[PDB]
Each structure stands twice: as C-alpha cells, then as structure tokens.
Design a binder for these strands. Structure first.
Ligand SMILES: [K+]
Ligand SMILES: [K+]
Ligand SMILES: [K+]
Ligand SMILES: [K+]
Ligand SMILES: [K+]
Ligand SMILES: [K+]
Ligand SMILES: [K+]
Ligand SMILES: [K+]
Ligand SMILES: [K+]
Ligand SMILES: [K+]
Ligand SMILES: [K+]
Ligand SMILES: [K+]
Ligand SMILES: [Mg+2]
Ligand SMILES: [Mg+2]
Ligand SMILES: [Mg+2]
Ligand SMILES: [Mg+2]
Ligand SMILES: [Mg+2]
Ligand SMILES: [Mg+2]
Ligand SMILES: [Mg+2]
Ligand SMILES: [Mg+2]
Ligand SMILES: [Mg+2]
Ligand SMILES: [Mg+2]
Ligand SMILES: [Mg+2]
Ligand SMILES: [Mg+2]
Ligand SMILES: [Mg+2]
Ligand SMILES: [Mg+2]
Ligand SMILES: [Mg+2]
Ligand SMILES: [Mg+2]
Ligand SMILES: [Mg+2]
Ligand SMILES: [Mg+2]
Ligand SMILES: [Mg+2]
Ligand SMILES: [Mg+2]
Ligand SMILES: [Mg+2]
Ligand SMILES: [Mg+2]
Ligand SMILES: [Mg+2]
Ligand SMILES: [Mg+2]
Ligand SMILES: [Mg+2]
Ligand SMILES: [Mg+2]
Ligand SMILES: [Mg+2]
Ligand SMILES: [Mg+2]
Ligand SMILES: [Mg+2]
Ligand SMILES: [Mg+2]
Ligand SMILES: [Mg+2]
Ligand SMILES: [Mg+2]
Ligand SMILES: [Mg+2]
Ligand SMILES: [Mg+2]
Lengths: 200, 79, 86, 79
RNA sequence: AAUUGAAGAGUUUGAUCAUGGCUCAGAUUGAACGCUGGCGGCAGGCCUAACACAUGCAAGUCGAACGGUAACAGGAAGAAGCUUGCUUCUUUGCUGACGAGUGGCGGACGGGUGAGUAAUGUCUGGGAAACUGCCUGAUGGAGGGGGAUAACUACUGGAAACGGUAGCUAAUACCGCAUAACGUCGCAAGACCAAAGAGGGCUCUUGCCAUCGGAUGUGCCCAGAUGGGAUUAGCUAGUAGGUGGGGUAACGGCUCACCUAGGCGACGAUCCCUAGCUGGUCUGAGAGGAUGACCAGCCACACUGGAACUGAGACACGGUCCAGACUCCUACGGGAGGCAGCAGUGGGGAAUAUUGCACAAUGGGCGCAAGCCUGAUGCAGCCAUGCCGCGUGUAUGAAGAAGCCCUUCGGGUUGUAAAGUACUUUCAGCGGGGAGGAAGGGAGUAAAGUUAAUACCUUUGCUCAUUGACGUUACCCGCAGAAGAAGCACCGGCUAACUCCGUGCCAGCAGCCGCGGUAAUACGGAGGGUGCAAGCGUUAAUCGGAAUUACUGGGCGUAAAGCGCACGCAGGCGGUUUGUUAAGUCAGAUGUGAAAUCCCCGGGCUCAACCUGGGAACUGCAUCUGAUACUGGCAA
C-alpha cells in the first residue's frame, strides 16, 4: 500500500522533477534527471499515444504516492462533480491533507510527512482527508522537539510557499482559504490526457 | 361519470349473454408503430336486446357466471 | 407431537371435534325436517318444523359453530320455500 | 394489532432506528404501513437524535394503534 | 442542485479498398484455482443433491380462570439428642410460590427453501358480493339454574409407546332457562338469538356478551403487462350460457338437475420445453442486453401422495389421520421419526463458515405486572470473498563498496540501492486508563384525579440502590526497538517495459497474428525494466466494444440476401373538400407509482467504505376536464 522503493527513478522515468527529494543538494548532482532508469536508459524510443497518456497519469500519481485504486476513485469523483473534470481531479488531489503537512513544511518529503502522520483543532491521521475552504490545519505540541520538523521547515523556507494558504511560525498553523484554480497549479500537467485515459 | 367501455357485438348466440370486442389502438413498445389490439369480454344482456354488429356501452359488475363480469349499459348503434 | 403445547392442542381439538360434530349433526337434523315437510307439501307441518329449527340455527351461530350468514341463509331459503307451498 | 415501534437500521455497533407504524405480526425490519420518525441513539452532540411526526402518531393512536415502550419514552422526551 | 454523454486495435492480400467473422483493451461476480499473504472497518459466504440426516437447541406462557399441593420457602399446632432456643423427624394450601392436570391465549407470527407454478402466480391500475383474534370508538347488557369431566383415588392391561375400568371434584370448561333490538328471517304481522368471572382496598381496576362503526389483515372479480417452440392448429361436455335447488364469509358451473348449443383459437387456443414474480442488480452514452444471490414486497412449498379437524385465521415446517418410500427401537404382540429453523454430520461438488455467547438493545408470544420464553435478533468464531482505510519505516548517505549483470574493456547500469550515520514508532506485541450502545424496570415517599376514604388504583414528579452478551470494547496514555510484516503478473505486435546466457521445428510458448530447424527482445534461466500491490495472476460467467439482429441504428446487381411468375383472402397502407366525433394524439389537474437502491444537496463515524436527513427521480398506470392540426370513426 506504499511505494517504498528508490524515489529518483520515478522522476527519471517521468523525465521531470516531481519534487520527491528533500533538497540537501541538487537533483542533477543526485541523479541523471535527463536519463530514464535502467540498463536501456540512455535509449528513448517513440512512445505511443497510449504510452503518453499513461506517463501523464503516472506523473500525477507518483508525486503524491497515490496508488492506482485510490487514484481511479479520485477520477470517478472528479467526473461526478459539476464542471471541468480534469480541473476537479487536480482540485481533489490538492485538497488532500497529506500534501499539506509536506507543503506547510513539517516533512522533508511527502514520505517523511506521511511517517509524521490537526484540522479545525481536531486530530486527523488520514493522508486522504479532503481539507475544505476556511479550515485551519495545524501541528501538535507533543512532537515539536523532533529535529526532522526543524530541518524540514528550513527546506520549506527556500521553496515558493503556496499562494492560497497561510503557513505560520511557532504554533505552526494555516488556513485552507479556498480551493486552487487551474491557474494556481503548474501549466505542465496535461490533465486532459488523464481524463482521456480513463474514458478509454 | 361512471366507468364504461364501448365495443362491437361479435356473438349473440348465448341466452342473456353477448361477446363484445373492445378495439384499442396502442403504440408498439419497441418499434413505435400504432397497432390494433382486441379484448373480447363476455357481457350480460338480460333482455337479449343486442345483435351481431351493434355498438354497445358496457360496465364492469360482480361475477354473473364463470366468464361474465360485465353488463350491458346501452346500445349506441344497431346494425 | 414433539412439543408439549402441541400434544395438548391435539387433545383439546379432538374434544372440540366431538362436541362440534354432535351439535352440527343435531342442527342439520332439524333443517332436514323442514325440507322433508316441504317435499311432502304441507305448510302447517313445515312452519312447525321451521319454528323448531329457527332457535337452533340462531344459537349455533351465536356459539360460533356456524356463521350468522349461514343461519340467515337457512331461514331465508326455507321461509321463501314455505311461502310458495300453498 | 397496529403498533408504532422501532425498526433497527444503521450498521453493526451503530444502530439507527426508523419509527414505523406496522401490523405487529410483521418482522421488525419488514412490511410497515407508514414511517413517522427516526431515533439515533449514538447521535453526536449538535445533531438531531430524534424526530417524530407527533400529528401522524396521534392519528394512528386515535385509530387504536399501540406504542412500544421505547417509542412511548421517545414521545415523552421529545415534547 | 438532481439522464455533462458515445475512442478503438490485431488478424484474409504481393499490396489495396470493401465485405465479413474470429480475437483483444473495459466494467462486473455469492466465484474457483495457482503463487503469495501484515493489520483494521463494513459487508458477504451450499450457486451443486427440494440428497440422506447422529446430537443439542429454534414455542411457550398465565396461580389476577380452576381444582389442587409433587417440589421447597415461610407460618401455626403437637412431641423427641433437647446449643432455655431452636436446627431435626412428624401434621397442616394457612401464605410466598409451584411439578402434573383442567381452562385461556399463543403455536397461521417469527425463521427456512425455491421443488412446483408461464398463470387459481407476479406487476400496474381498477372493482364488488365478503369475513376479520388481539387494538379502538359508541350504545346497551352482564339475570337465574343445571349436568359433567380431567387431575385425584382404587383396581388394572402393555416390553415400551400408550391405555382400560369404577368412583370423586373445580372453573372464565360445557349446556338449558330468562332477558332481546339501530341484530337475524319476514312484504308486513310476527318469530327468533347472548353472556363470566377475577383481582386490590361498598369502591376501583380488569375481563365477559350483543349490536353498529374504525383500524388492520385476509378472501374474491376485471383489464393491460409478464419466456421459448407452428419441425405443436385446432381445443372444449360442467364444456359456454340460462333457469331452479343446494353450497360458501362472500360473487361464481362452486355443485347438482333440467334447458339452450354454445365457449376458446393465427391478436397463437391446445400441446411441448424452460422458469418462482417484483422492487431492483450488472452492463450500456442511451435505446437495449443480461439477470432476480444478499436486502425488502408478493407467491409457493415443509420426507412423498392424499385428507380433513381445531381455529378469527391453517387444509398447518418443529399439529392430527391415512397411505407410500426410507430408516430406527421391540419382550416379535407392536411402536417411533422427518434440519428447505440455528449449529453440525455424511454425500455430491471447482466451491461456500462454529455442534459459540446473550436476551443487555430492537422486535415477537403469554402475563395486571414482576417476569418467563424467543438459534427472531444483537453479537462473537471461521474464510483476502468483495469494498474501503492503514502498515511493512523516514532522512541522510559515493565508497558510486563488494557481489550482480552488460560492455565496442573506456565504461555503463542496478543504485542512495545496501552499508554507515541521524532519527521516527503508526499498526502488531506488552502494561495502565476509559466512552457509548440504558431506554427502562424495582423500592418507599410527593401532589392531584377516582372514591364512603386523607383507601386501593391511575398518572406525573420525587429520591435511593441497580440492569451490557459483545468485552481484556471503541478510544486514550505509557514501554521497547527498525524492530514482527512484499508479493504477483508481465516486457515480439496489439500493449506500458530489452539485454545476455542455455536450447536448436527439440524442449517448449500462444488471447489473436504467430514464435522455436545455431547469434530467439516470443521457449527456459539470469540481469535490468514495466504494471498492479496485500494482493496478483489464471479459468468461468454477463454486458461492452459488436451499427455483428441495426427501435434509436444495417443490408439484398457482382460480397450472405428479390419467391420462377402471377392472382388474391386476412393484414399493413390510403387522393381531395366540408361537417361531425374525439378513438389515436396533445394539454392540464387529481389519485397512485411501498421502503431500500440509483442520483442531488446536506448530516454522522478521525477519513473512506459504511450509516443517515430532505429532495429529485420512479420515464408508468388510471381517472377527470379541455384542445382538434394530424391519423382513425361517421355523414355528405
Ligand atoms: K396451556
Ligand atoms: K475486423
Ligand atoms: K410459521
Ligand atoms: K421455484
Ligand atoms: K365447472
Ligand atoms: K346457474
Ligand atoms: K428487468
Ligand atoms: K408437496
Ligand atoms: K384463536
Ligand atoms: K429481548
Ligand atoms: K433499422
Ligand atoms: K378528425
Ligand atoms: Mg487496499
Ligand atoms: Mg501475409
Ligand atoms: Mg404450575
Ligand atoms: Mg412467515
Ligand atoms: Mg350463569
Ligand atoms: Mg364459556
Ligand atoms: Mg334465549
Ligand atoms: Mg426455430
Ligand atoms: Mg426436426
Ligand atoms: Mg343459481
Ligand atoms: Mg369465477
Ligand atoms: Mg424450478
Ligand atoms: Mg452501444
Ligand atoms: Mg428469491
Ligand atoms: Mg425475467
Ligand atoms: Mg372451523
Ligand atoms: Mg406449526
Ligand atoms: Mg424440522
Ligand atoms: Mg442447517
Ligand atoms: Mg467431494
Ligand atoms: Mg427453550
Ligand atoms: Mg511498447
Ligand atoms: Mg541464442
Ligand atoms: Mg470472457
Ligand atoms: Mg448491439
Ligand atoms: Mg452489413
Ligand atoms: Mg458467387
Ligand atoms: Mg450472392
Ligand atoms: Mg425476379
Ligand atoms: Mg399483385
Ligand atoms: Mg387520407
Ligand atoms: Mg382521446
Ligand atoms: Mg421508492
Ligand atoms: Mg377526418
């Protein structure tokens, strides 16, 4: 139920930074981001229309560590909800709480943030929890002596912190103010390929 | 009103009884064409008024025999 | 029977069968006398037999041996037939 | 006779009762005449634990419906 | 807000376009099998033999109907080792209670199964000639007698099951009599029909009878709809109708006698084959197609065939009688039994669980109640069967260590992977705390209403104890240490993923095309990789793709397909004008279309699955009122 394997290979297979590393040093110095993994790695054949649609879906999955069954259920939810399905799907993935622990800067990676796993002042230890507009997300007091969370925040303080949220120091809390639009997120995900892949 | 059907007498051979054909015009469930369908009722006719070809109003009543649960109301048209 | 209450019901129902059969037989005997008087074709004999029958069918209806509608039918059928006789 | 009683719905360890008017002989969760309310015994604070259509209950009690012990107790604590 | 919804590909050929089948990608399941397997939540779990069934349990209850007193617990009398105060052996229903018995109510519910049933069924919508325990409203009654009988007692027959004889006794058991009308019969006059007490302290409570209502349940009738076969075309004598008698709760050929000769059928009768029906379920863009397991409604069945009895209700799963096929006990004379209740056994099968705990909750039976009963139900056990959630670490870490594997021997790749070093402790283990599912019921006291009464009773408050099968509960806190926890399929194209070695048309692979005869990305192993993940594959099965049965939505010159040609009955279709009708059609309204499910907006379990509030939907059916262009009818 978790991918517990070498993490750089995913970014290598996708051929893009998926933000899967802590950032103690550069991605180029860590691995060959240009090259796909394995013995036949410097090779790069033509990929089919199917193969392209697959790799876009596997991109959006492998960032978050969402396995296929759970990802499929998000697609179904996104298609069900009113309006644009591809946008609804990204909104649902962005609405997840386990993004937030990482994104607010408590884990160095999402894998670390997931090891570390309060919303509206109530404890929630579920990665898949959909955080709503106007909800305050925050940390406990009992585990603020961990060096992990200290280091992770210093890693977080070099990134561009998200632009629909409000992370705070000390008591360490922030409001999910609104759901992100597609404008907020990377114009790089071609989510129509995922919509098309599941329509197949 | 009280409930009635209208139909054509197709037999008057029984004593105090007639057979009335009710024609209905119904849309075919699959193919959509309107089709003629027929329901034959055994009807009570105390006086033996009706003849083969008459148009008759009939009403539902209590069972009067094995096959009869309808009675004659009027003759609309004699043949 | 396996169950205790079922054994008791079998006994009670047999007792009730005997009791009922006696009263049913008696009631039918009194009804038959009215029909027999009619068959012969004598009104005074039939009205006598009917006046004996009438309390019996009514009482057996009250006791639940027959329904009151059945008692009513017997009185109606025979009153009609007695009226047609002379 | 006709009774007003609780049909047990919900899930395992988490009962939710529908308040139904039924012929007493029918199974608890089976054939009923009319639903007239619900009762959640494990309802969180803020949520409505009990709703009863007391007018419909009064109609049925007027026609000789009995009430289970629990529904009688729920009728008390509501009003 | 609540139908935002529709993808193709491989394979005929030297190549092409078309035609056309085969095959694949998807979704799904009561699944099974193989490999593998950590935890939890919620659900599901004999689809085959309606095969046969050992054992336990699944229906009792009421002493406030009754005689009683086998228990054992008091109480009173009368006496013995006499702990000068009583145990004990005795007597006694006097009292709490209560075995057996009479009586009442229940046993027709609840639970199981799908054999039969293609229409005495089911679904939708109507109807008239009916009954209906318990519950409920109203109006009255509730008087006075009698003969029994079980238990019991004496005798007694049987191996047992189970009786026989005689005597005795009670009632809310049973039976007259009286009373008798908004009841029954009758045109009327008349005639006729009932009943039961018990309990608490005259009064209250409860029961009894009658009649008319209500409610609920059930019986009955009609129309439409609900599989296949014409290589089944005729079927029918109580048959179709009538009259009269009988019968039923009730209409009715329901039955019988007589009379008429009908009735059904190409709009498929009759016969044959298959089948429980529905809400729904799966699939599908939809229209369809497939399906009816779980949950809920209806039906049917209870070892097989038949039958009734009792009863408000049964032709009765754990009742009766008979017969039959089985099987078991026997003193050989006779007797006994029916898991398609729950659990379980054998058998069949690819395959489907424990001879568990509890009535604490909800519901059911009986009871004034306390309570008793309840394999319904609530729970627990077993199983990755499904769905949903979580874990199996996290960070760093070049030495790019070994060992792999490949290499044009430069290197590349596995791989930051491992180690090493910081850390973390969910879940599992171990130890401490702790909801909720409990409402009620029981005690005396509080006031008011009944009342001769400041009584009993009723109700509501009042206070004090007390009720949990699950359960070592959810959940919380603490301890120890990465510790206890990753597999399965695939990598020639379709199809995401490629190399080396072994083999040499062999061994083998294969869904389809194909692959293998010495440099095989196709076989087998390895290294690497891709996809899924506590699962993964395979097989089976349904829909999809398949516009490949084409209603939506196809064809027939040569691909499969125009009868050899005509006439013509049924049937389908019908030029043009006016009037009329209002069947089709259209509009509106009303009733109905169970709940669940689906969908929408919310709510609750930390989330999810799951549970749940309201809505929408249920495309239908019926009725009423309108419209009159078009189609139909009628008239000209
Ligand atoms: K009894
Ligand atoms: K083809
Ligand atoms: K039953
Ligand atoms: K069946
Ligand atoms: K007949
Ligand atoms: K007749
Ligand atoms: K269907
Ligand atoms: K049978
Ligand atoms: K009864
Ligand atoms: K109980
Ligand atoms: K067509
Ligand atoms: K017209
Ligand atoms: Mg999972
Ligand atoms: Mg070729
Ligand atoms: Mg007793
Ligand atoms: Mg039942
Ligand atoms: Mg008396
Ligand atoms: Mg009596
Ligand atoms: Mg009298
Ligand atoms: Mg054929
Ligand atoms: Mg043949
Ligand atoms: Mg007759
Ligand atoms: Mg009939
Ligand atoms: Mg069958
Ligand atoms: Mg289609
Ligand atoms: Mg079924
Ligand atoms: Mg069907
Ligand atoms: Mg009877
Ligand atoms: Mg029974
Ligand atoms: Mg049985
Ligand atoms: Mg069983
Ligand atoms: Mg076997
Ligand atoms: Mg028992
Ligand atoms: Mg490929
Ligand atoms: Mg080779
Ligand atoms: Mg298949
Ligand atoms: Mg099709
Ligand atoms: Mg074609
Ligand atoms: Mg040819
Ligand atoms: Mg040809
Ligand atoms: Mg020709
Ligand atoms: Mg011609
Ligand atoms: Mg015309
Ligand atoms: Mg019309
Ligand atoms: Mg509904
Ligand atoms: Mg016209």
């Amino acid at each position: 139920a978790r991918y517990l394997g070498p993490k750089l290979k995913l970014s290598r297979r996708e051929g893009t930074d998926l933000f899967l590393k802590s950032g103690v040093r550069a991605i180029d110095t860590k691995c060959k981001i240009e090259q796909a993994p394995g013995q036949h790695g410097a090779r790069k054949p033509r990929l089919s229309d199917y193969g392209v649609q697959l790799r876009e879906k596997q991109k959006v999955r492998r960032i978050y560590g969402v396995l296929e069954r759970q990802f499929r259920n998000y697609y179904k939810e996104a298609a069900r909800l009113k309006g644009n399905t591809g946008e609804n799907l990204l909104a649902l993935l962005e609405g997840r709480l386990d993004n937030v622990v990482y994104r607010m800067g408590f884990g160095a990676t999402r894998a670390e943030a997931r090891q570390l796993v309060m919303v509206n002042g109530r404890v929630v230890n579920i990665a898949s929890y959909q955080v709503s507009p106007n909800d305050v997300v925050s940390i406990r007091e009992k585990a603020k002596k961990q060096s992990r969370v200290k280091a992770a925040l210093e890693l977080a303080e070099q990134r561009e912190k998200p632009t629909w949220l409000e992370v705070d120091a000390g008591k360490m809390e922030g409001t999910f103010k609104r759901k992100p639009e597609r404008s907020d997120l990377s114009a790089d995900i071609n989510e129509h390929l995922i919509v098309e892949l599941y329509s197949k | 009103k009280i409930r009635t059907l209208q139909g054509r007498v197709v037999s008057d051979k029984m004593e105090k009884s007639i057979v009335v054909a009710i024609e209905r015009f119904v849309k075919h469930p699959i193919y959509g064409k309107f089709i003629k369908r027929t329901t034959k009722l055994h009807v009570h006719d105390e006086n033996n008024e009706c003849g083969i070809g008459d148009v008759v109003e009939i009403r539902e009543c209590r069972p009067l025999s094995k096959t009869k649960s309808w009675t004659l109301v009027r003759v609309v048209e004699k043949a | 029977a396996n169950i205790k209450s079922a054994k008791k019901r079998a006994i009670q129902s047999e007792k009730a069968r005997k009791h009922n059969a006696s009263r049913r037989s008696m009631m039918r005997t009194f009804i038959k006398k009215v029909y027999a008087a009619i068959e012969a074709g004598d009104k005074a004999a039939a009205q006598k037999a009917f006046n004996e029958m009438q309390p019996i069918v009514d009482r057996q209806a009250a006791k639940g041996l027959i329904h009151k509608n059945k008692a009513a039918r017997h009185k109606a059928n025979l009153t009609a037939q007695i009226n047609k006789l002379a | 006779m006709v009774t007003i009683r609780l049909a047990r719905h919900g899930a395992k360890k988490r009962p939710f009762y529908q308040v139904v008017v039924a012929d007493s002989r029918n199974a608890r969760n089976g054939r009923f005449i009319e639903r007239v309310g619900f009762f959640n015994p494990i309802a969180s604070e803020k949520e409505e634990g009990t709703r009863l259509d007391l007018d419909r209950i009064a109609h049925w009690v007027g026609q000789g419906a009995t009430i289970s012990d629990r529904v009688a107790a729920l009728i008390k604590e509501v009003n």
